[PDB]
Amino acid sequence: SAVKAARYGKDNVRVYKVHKDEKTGVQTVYEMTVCVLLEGEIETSYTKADNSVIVATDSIKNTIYITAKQNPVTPPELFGSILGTHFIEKYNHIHAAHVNIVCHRWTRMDIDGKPHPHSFIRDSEEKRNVQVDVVEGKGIDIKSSLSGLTVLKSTNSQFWGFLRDEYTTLKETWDRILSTDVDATWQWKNFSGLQEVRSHVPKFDATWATAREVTLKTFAEDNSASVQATMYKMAEQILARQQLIETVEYSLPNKHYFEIDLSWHKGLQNTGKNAEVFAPQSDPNGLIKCTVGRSS
Amino acid sequence: SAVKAARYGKDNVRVYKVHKDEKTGVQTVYEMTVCVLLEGEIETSYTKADNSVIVATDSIKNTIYITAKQNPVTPPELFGSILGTHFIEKYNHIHAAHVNIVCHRWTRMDIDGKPHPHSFIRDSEEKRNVQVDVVEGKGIDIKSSLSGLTVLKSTNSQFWGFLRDEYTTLKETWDRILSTDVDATWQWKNFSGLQEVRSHVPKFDATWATAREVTLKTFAEDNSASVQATMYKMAEQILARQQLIETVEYSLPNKHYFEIDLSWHKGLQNTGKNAEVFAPQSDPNGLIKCTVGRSS
Amino acid sequence: SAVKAARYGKDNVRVYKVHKDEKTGVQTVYEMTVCVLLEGEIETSYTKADNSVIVATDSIKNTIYITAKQNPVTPPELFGSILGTHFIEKYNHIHAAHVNIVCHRWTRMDIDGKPHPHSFIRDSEEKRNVQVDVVEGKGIDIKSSLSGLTVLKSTNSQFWGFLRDEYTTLKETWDRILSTDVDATWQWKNFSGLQEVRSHVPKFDATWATAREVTLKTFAEDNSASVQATMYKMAEQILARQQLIETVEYSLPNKHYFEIDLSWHKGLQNTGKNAEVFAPQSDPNGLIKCTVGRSS
Amino acid sequence: SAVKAARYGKDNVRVYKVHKDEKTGVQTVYEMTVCVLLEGEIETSYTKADNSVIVATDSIKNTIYITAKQNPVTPPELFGSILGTHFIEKYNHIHAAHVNIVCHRWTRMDIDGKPHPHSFIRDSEEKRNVQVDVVEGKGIDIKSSLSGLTVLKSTNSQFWGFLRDEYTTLKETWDRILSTDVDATWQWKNFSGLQEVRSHVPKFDATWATAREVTLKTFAEDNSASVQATMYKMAEQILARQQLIETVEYSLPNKHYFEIDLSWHKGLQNTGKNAEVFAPQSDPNGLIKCTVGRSS
Numbered sequence A, B, C, D: 001s002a003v004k005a006a007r008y009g010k011d012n013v014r015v016y017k018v019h020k021d022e023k024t025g026v027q028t029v030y031e032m033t034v035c036v037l038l039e040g041e042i043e044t045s046y047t048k049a050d051n052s053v054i055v056a057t058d059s060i061k062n063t064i065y066i067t068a069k070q071n072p073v074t075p076p077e078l079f080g081s082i083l084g085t086h087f088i089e090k091y092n093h094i095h096a097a098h099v100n101i102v103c104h105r106w107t108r109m110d111i112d113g114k115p116h117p118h119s120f121i122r123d124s125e126e127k128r129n130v131q132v133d134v135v136e137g138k139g140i141d142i143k144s145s146l147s148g149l150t151v152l153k154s155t156n157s158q159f160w161g162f163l164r165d166e167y168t169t170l171k172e173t174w175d176r177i178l179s180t181d182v183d184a185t186w187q188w189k190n191f192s193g194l195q196e197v198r199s200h201v202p203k204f205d206a207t208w209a210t211a212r213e214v215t216l217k218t219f220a221e222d223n224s225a226s227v228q229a230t231m232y233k234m235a236e237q238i239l240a241r242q243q244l245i246e247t248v249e250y251s252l253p254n255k256h257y258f259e260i261d262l263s264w265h266k267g268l269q270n271t272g273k274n275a276e277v278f279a280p281q282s283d284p285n286g287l288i289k290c291t292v293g294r295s296s
């Protein structure tokens, strides 16, 4: 036998950082969960009990905290790039660092219509994420995403004209509920290293904001033919707005809301145009995925 | 042996309802999870296999949907009261109905600064809940709550002057992080029946909004001596603002954010006044509870 | 305003303990999650910012670990009783201690048919729990439970003869699936204090084993008329077998498995006697509860 | 813009099947969760609102149930292969089917030492899984796995001789707790189609049983130098025992159990040889991964 692939490190490292403006009193907080996995000349830790090649996972955890102390933690694309670059530069035998960051929302509270200097609310479980792959001699591959953005529209969704055969029971509809949890990922052009990531820093927050705005406005305004057709419109608009993105990927559940026929009970009309009360379905769910890139 | 207590019914009944203004095109959505448990002369279903006394749980589920079709689902205090009253009135041998409702957030989207007529976002996992106990001959007992309201303040929290003995290691602090998930419950005066609940309908949404506003403003502005002292201030303000509330209860975790001593590493200063990077603790957590009522 | 009730402490305290027989090499592990909440003359921590009456939650956490070091952690009824008694005896102004323990399974591995001396498997998420209320001058109230015991039987469950009216759609059945997650609680006679709990120590493990055995054998062998009728049989048998139990409570979901009519597809027969493939329903679920005590 | 990748289908399809031996009365149950995602000439559903190329996700769900009615659901490698083959054969324009199956445990109950004919227990949340990729013209790629197998050993784990630099605080240890949740995957040789999968049917259950037995025995008996070194031993043994496996992958968290220094309290000794009480850590966790194949 031989090791064909290996990576190891620390997962689920919770990190908070505060910035304090001593002049204004305004404080700003950042909270994330971090995973760092390393690759390199480590096969003998697996095959020969050679721990000399292991940077302990506990040490990786200490390094995450030290890196957060000494560097900006925002945008997360930069933090990830700094952290991954640290490992491949510090350790000769470490050749790749895989950094995953989940950013948790801490939105400043408005109290009596004024932003509060040091109080925050978790206004949803929506996340901003990065996957940063720092590979010695191959640069830095960044995927940026938003996830857990839960939305519903009560009309202006349709689904008709699909294939009908002996496996088909679904009725065509010209007016349904559409609800999803948005997972949207944009894949950056390969960066040569940390300097090139630093040169694009303003683009990270701006592209996240664009992706979010395009997703919400497209969902709200598209008279949707299908999840497929609506998600493609979001992806093509994000690509048009950031030339430094190669691809946009959506992964969208179709969280079904079923009509309830109540006609058995006193002739109550609760279907088609009279549909008022629905049964949200926990499972199963449609799952629709696309990766969109630029045409030849 | 004998049955000392019994209740049975349907849990985890997901319900959506849409209101459509045909004149403006504006649609409004409501989504909840409902549990209805019945009590009454049902002991023989347990002791004698006598199913004649059972209103099937499936029938209870149908009744929830039919009730939502025929009645307002808001405020949830009213919906619960209607649903519970239905069971004790319809079935001679059913003497109590216990209705628990969790309301899920569907906040109207603003698109290009204008409220969208039929698109919604789940802006957090914060819930609005009710527990409605409809008891034949004893009226309607309502507890209203907000839950899952996750907040953090980065300063203006203290914890000193607590008991110190041979079990104590905790350092006194004059400046810490305070973060919690707010569970706040207000217990209404007993209502004689559904008519009295209907007579107070406007008070339900207003008291929820007051409870939420008092919680946020008190959390943000109190230079907190303890979770205990801050939560008591919230409870006393809500009681002062709604005479139809008998008690206010808070249940608050103290979600600890620990300082990280980095002085072992190149003399980095990250404690006390220099504390910037913290380790959020998933467990354990403080848990602080109060029920506040009006003084003799 | 005034404090009507208050309790505070530490929740989600994870504890592991190992016993090592130095003579045989056999090691035995115990793992739990502990919550301790205290009550007493603590209202001024809430009303006056008086932290002098607070035994810090951090100190409560230290005390749990110290208590586990100095005392047996099994049976959990004893551990809870020791821990709660410690707080009301040590602190004059603490008058009650509420101790909740969840015990996690670590079952010794059999390797090549021989019990391994120091290797363990989590053979399910079933828990053994206690709720121990130690109240100064009123003794020790213990509820013992098993929870998360997930079972299914594929026949020998029925449900017919229930009430049928204009809300009823459910078909009577003489052969269905029954599946549940068992939550069973036995309430002990009040104990005068820790000495009386110690005097009954062997009864705790034996009564848990009896409750589990009665639940499994009754579920497997009862040709069930209803969840109600089967759970009552379990409760009455446990009461008959331990005179030191006052009540037995079950809380049982009816985790529905729905037939799937496939007759629309090539006349496939998959209902009634031909039912082979079913759709397990995640929600809603029946919820059936009983408390059984001894007859007058 | 253009579609670079697309797949869509139904996720979280819960399926139960019962086998009834009419001669012995013995019933056997199977329960799974299924996801089927299709690929093919479907880009115009995304780009042109052309639903004619969509096999509705609802139809995919019906097909899963119909396939379970007409075919064995065990081993899951076979079921997945049948289901995926159905889609690429039935629909000319569908060129790949991605089938993921999670199998839930329903272990026959022993009542008074005899196997019960129709009663079952969920004896843990451990899963048996498959990922079956059926690709028109490229055959069937199967990954088989076990997951959620939670184990702990109380000694005979070590971790010393790792890299020590200015980021390192971890103490070397010659005797620690090791606990993990096992995720083990074996990748089969490519199969040409469904006939070749059928020709290997007995190997699927046998290889799962081998993987499980090797994992447990290796964990229990290895005096472990590291997670890395122990997992490699498991992988090399599974490869040696099934020539039809190309690779074995483990993904293992190191679920840390920390010593608790109690020496501040009455000089209690609870570290090193005297360590009895530990604090299980929920996060962070080490995460160790290997893919092992056969040497050149």
Ligand SMILES: O=c1[nH]c(=O)c2nn[nH]c2[nH]1
Pocket: A159, A170, A225, A226, A227, A228, A254, A286, A288, D008, D054, D055, D056, D057, D058, D059
């Ligand atoms: O938007 C949709 N896409 C699909 O592919 C589909 N299948 N069923 N319903 C559906 N809705």
Ligand SMILES: O=c1[nH]c(=O)c2nn[nH]c2[nH]1
Pocket: B159, B170, B225, B226, B227, B228, B254, B286, B288, C008, C054, C055, C056, C057, C058, C059
């Ligand atoms: O606000 C607090 N209350 C307490 O009771 C406590 N105990 N430790 N820390 C604490 N913080």
Ligand SMILES: O=c1[nH]c(=O)c2nn[nH]c2[nH]1
Pocket: B008, B054, B055, B056, B057, B058, B059, C159, C170, C225, C226, C227, C228, C254, C286, C288
């Ligand atoms: O066992 C059952 N009890 C009930 O009360 C019930 N209601 N629907 N199905 C049921 N099954």
Ligand SMILES: O=c1[nH]c(=O)c2nn[nH]c2[nH]1
Pocket: A008, A054, A055, A056, A057, A058, A059, D159, D170, D225, D226, D227, D228, D254, D286, D288
């Ligand atoms: O088994 C281990 N492997 C590692 O890579 C490691 N790092 N810290 N502790 C560890 N334990």
Ligand SMILES: [Kr]
Pocket: A015, A016, A017, A030, A031, A032, A068, A073
């Ligand atoms: Kr952070």
Ligand SMILES: [Kr]
Pocket: A180, A219, A226, A227, A230, A231, A252
């Ligand atoms: Kr969408």
Ligand SMILES: [Kr]
Pocket: A206, A207, A208, A210, A211, A237, A238, A239, A241, A242
């Ligand atoms: Kr963008």
Ligand SMILES: [Kr]
Pocket: B015, B016, B017, B030, B031, B032, B068, B073
């Ligand atoms: Kr609703």
Ligand SMILES: [Kr]
Pocket: B180, B219, B226, B227, B230, B231, B252
């Ligand atoms: Kr608070």
Ligand SMILES: [Kr]
Pocket: B206, B207, B208, B210, B211, B237, B238, B239, B241, B242
């Ligand atoms: Kr209020």
Ligand SMILES: [Kr]
Pocket: C015, C016, C017, C030, C031, C032, C068, C073
């Ligand atoms: Kr323990």
Ligand SMILES: [Kr]
Pocket: C180, C219, C226, C227, C230, C231, C252
């Ligand atoms: Kr039961």
Ligand SMILES: [Kr]
Pocket: C206, C207, C208, C210, C211, C237, C238, C239, C241, C242
């Ligand atoms: Kr018992």
Ligand SMILES: [Kr]
Pocket: D015, D016, D017, D030, D031, D032, D068, D073
């Ligand atoms: Kr199945």
Ligand SMILES: [Kr]
Pocket: D180, D219, D226, D227, D230, D231, D252
């Ligand atoms: Kr391991």
Ligand SMILES: [Kr]
Pocket: D206, D207, D208, D210, D211, D237, D238, D239, D241, D242
């Ligand atoms: Kr194997």
